[PDB]
Amino acid sequence: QVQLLESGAELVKPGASVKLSCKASGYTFTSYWMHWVKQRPGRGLEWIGMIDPNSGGTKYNEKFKSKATLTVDKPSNTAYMQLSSLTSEDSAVYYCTRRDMDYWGAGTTVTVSSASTKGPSVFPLAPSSKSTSGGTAALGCLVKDYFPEPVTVSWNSGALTSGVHTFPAVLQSSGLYSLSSVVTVPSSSLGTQTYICNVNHKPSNTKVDKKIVPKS
């Protein structure tokens, strides 16, 4: 099956430069051309450039032409885009897609700040056996004080996915992002089933597992 796995979210200091990866497989790499697309928070979509895996020839959007550069590696089937002189405008999500954009990558989140990373703390939103009724109970995890985006959170190692609501991140005044993840479940299971939220923050190489038990 066709897959385009790419670099994990990376934080980069203003002025530095990053090189993003895009490992292909499931298809003859040297045949189809490769694209790169910049998204950037809540905005449109901007095509960056195109690169021919085989020959090596390329075509850029006469805008990122100077800031970005596309290269490949015939052997390992990996496309590389390098950004230089990064600024706040450069912060965005980057996608590498195949020629007819039928297959895209999950995208890499590139955040440009002089600030430095900070792993999130994780506090449990305890199921309130008294303030969480109606036949069903709500419980969750508070993911607080981390930077930069993004942080991904799944429950019971991905085994639980129904009733899960992971709220969009909020930027606090401190300049750090905060966020929470809740889940509704049958009240009757609070005393037997264990709920664990798995929080991942690649930018700081952090992985936290927190058990949420009914508060007493």
Binding site: A126, L142, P168
Partner: protein, 213 residues
């Protein structure tokens, strides 16, 4: 540069209604136009290429039409599974261009929210901060007023809120509000109250607690 202007910016239909999105070019392109669907979270999915052909898999309810400079995409039987953002693209002249995108929500009967409150974990208290979280689950429309009242007193500026994207199955939204204060003040007052005034209730419904343990 061929500017693809997309309209509208935010549409909103009902389940079963039809949706129409137009994309105008600044100059004739021909037939090399496409449309993508991006659901909140994941990346875009190709829906239609060459102005009217459907990519294998895309259900017949999605229709791409028009030609020359004006293109349009139509959703015949809008179903909750089509809730998302849609994008128009042009690939006849470099650089490839995208339209501003359209966000597609869904209208539905009202739903009052199910409100819950969570006192701060003993854990966080130690770190010298007390975050209090109030949750408003599955309601519609999204216009909701969450007011935080600590011991009959109203707060302001000391709390933030986040709202989910439209549930891809309930067509509802959900909101969380976090009252962020010092471990200091939290130990002082005793009554923490969350009052929500939704256009689905008669009087402001409220959930609250009192520092138990």
């Amino acid at each position: 540069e061929l500017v693809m202007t997309q309209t509208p910016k935010f549409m909103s239909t009902t389940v079963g209604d039809r949706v129409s999105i137009t994309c105008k070019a600044s100059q004739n392109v021909g037939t090399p136009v496409a449309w993508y669907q991006q659901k909140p979270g994941q990346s875009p999915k190709l829906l239609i290429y060459s102005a009217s052909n459907r990519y294998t898999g895309v259900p017949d309810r999605f229709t791409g039409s028009g030609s020359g400079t004006d293109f349009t995409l139509t959703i015949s039987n809008m179903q909750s599974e089509d809730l998302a953002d849609y994008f128009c693209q042009q690939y006849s002249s470099y650089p490839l261009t995208f339209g501003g995108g359209t966000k597609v929500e869904i209208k539905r009967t009202v739903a009052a929210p199910s409100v819950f409150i969570f006192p701060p974990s003993d854990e966080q208290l130690k770190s010298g901060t007390a975050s209090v979280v109030c949750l408003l689950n599955n309601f519609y429309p999204r216009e909701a007023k969450v007011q935080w009242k600590v011991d009959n007193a109203l707060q302001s500026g000391n709390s933030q809120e986040s709202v989910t994207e439209q549930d891809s199955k309930d067509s509802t939204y959900s909101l969380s509000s976090t009252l962020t204060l010092s471990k200091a003040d939290y130990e002082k007052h005793k009554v923490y109250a969350c009052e929500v005034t939704h256009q689905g209730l008669s009087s402001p419904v409220t959930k609250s607690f009192n520092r138990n343990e």
